[PDB]
């Protein structure tokens, strides 16, 4: 347990990067319905 002040920014940046990669990956086009 550290919960350093920088941990919040590191976590938010990590989630932002992961979400951007997920959104721009083929997985999001797959998520859109075919019909």
């Amino acid at each position: 347990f550290k919960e350093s002040p920088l941990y919040t920014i590191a976590l938010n940046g990590a989630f932002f990067v992961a979400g951007v990669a997920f959104i721009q990956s083929p997985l999001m086009d797959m998520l859109a319905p075919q019909l």
Binding site: T8, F15, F16, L31, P33
Partner: protein, 307 residues
């Protein structure tokens, strides 16, 4: 500057529309409500746009018990008054001097106190957009400026990237010097316009940066991460599905709350909204349905509405 007009840039969107693609389209921040609410809209004309909306919201703290609002809009002039319960009058007037230049004045009044009165002039150009607004403007005997004044400038450096700044002047009482801050904003548009990224290094070290993607004509998704001593920020993931019959909007927040907003168009006029949210950090839910009735009062308008 003839030789330096060869680049032929495109005008970037205004400063307030920087996050429109995400904050106001693929998120529930503006559409969310709680408890029941019936919204009756009356349309009286089409060419010169006129409308007379009504509201009946119960169980929502943010919303009022009743709210009468008449919206008038034509080619170059847009006005809207909004009476509310407790005689809290709100109003907005937009006048476009030129096609690309518009001056907007908002005014909200509650129990005889004009709490909000902001006048702003918006100037859009071939490559840059600049708008200046003055919140609660006034003058004092000592002669110095009073109230809050904000000026923002956005210039397109390249067709796919625009940079700008937002200058803020705020003075509360006028006795003490008015703190002034500057905010930096960036907007990147993909060559294909498939995805749009925008970053905002707001004042006080605040960083509101978002991303937007258009998966298809129906599905568009975006992400927004906010940051604000110790920081207090949240990351939001959102998506929206628009069809000929309904509009869906979902969002998973970093705080843990999961929300959705379904608007079924049972009829061309009547639309039944559903808006439910969950708060997994405290395990409580806030859900509210509603209504949206769009009934005309003129034979021509009804004929147009039915096709």
């Amino acid at each position: 500057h003839s030789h330096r007009q060869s680049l032929e840039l495109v005008n970037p969107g205004t400063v307030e529309n920087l996050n429109k693609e995400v904050s106001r389209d693929v998120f529930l921040s503006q559409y969310f409500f709680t408890g029941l609410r019936a919204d009756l809209n009356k349309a009286f004309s089409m060419n010169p746009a006129f409308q007379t909306s009504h509201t009946f919201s119960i169980g929502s703290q943010a919303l009022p018990k009743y709210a009468f609002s008449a919206l008038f809009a034509n080619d170059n002039l847009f006005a809207q008054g909004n009476i509310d319960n407790d005689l809290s009058v709100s109003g907005r007037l937009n006048y476009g001097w030129d096609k690309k230049n518009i001056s907007k004045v908002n005014l909200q009044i509650s129990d005889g106190q004009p709490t909000m009165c902001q006048l702003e002039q918006d100037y859009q150009a071939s490559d840059f957009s600049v708008n200046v607004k003055t919140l609660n403007p006034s003058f004092s005997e000592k002669g110095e400026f009073t109230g809050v004044a904000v000026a923002s400038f956005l210039q397109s450096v390249t067709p796919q990237l625009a940079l700008g700044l937002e200058t803020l002047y705020s003075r509360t009482d006028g006795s003490a010097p008015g703190d002034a801050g500057v905010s930096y904003l960036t907007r990147y548009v993909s060559k294909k316009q498939d995805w749009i990224f925008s970053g905002q290094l707001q004042a006080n070290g605040a960083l509101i940066a978002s991303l937007w993607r258009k998966v298809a004509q129906n599905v568009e998704a975006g992400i927004e991460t906010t940051l604000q001593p110790t920081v207090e920020g949240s990351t939001t993931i959102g998506a929206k599905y628009e069809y000929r019959q309904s509009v869906y909007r979902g969002t998973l927040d970093s705080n843990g709350k999961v929300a959705c907003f379904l608007e079924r168009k049972v009829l061309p006029t009547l639309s039944v909204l559903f808006c439910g949210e969950i708060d997994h950090f405290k395990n409580d839910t806030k859900i509210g349905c509603g209504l949206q009735f769009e009934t005309a009062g003129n034979q021509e308008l009804l004929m147009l509405q039915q096709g």
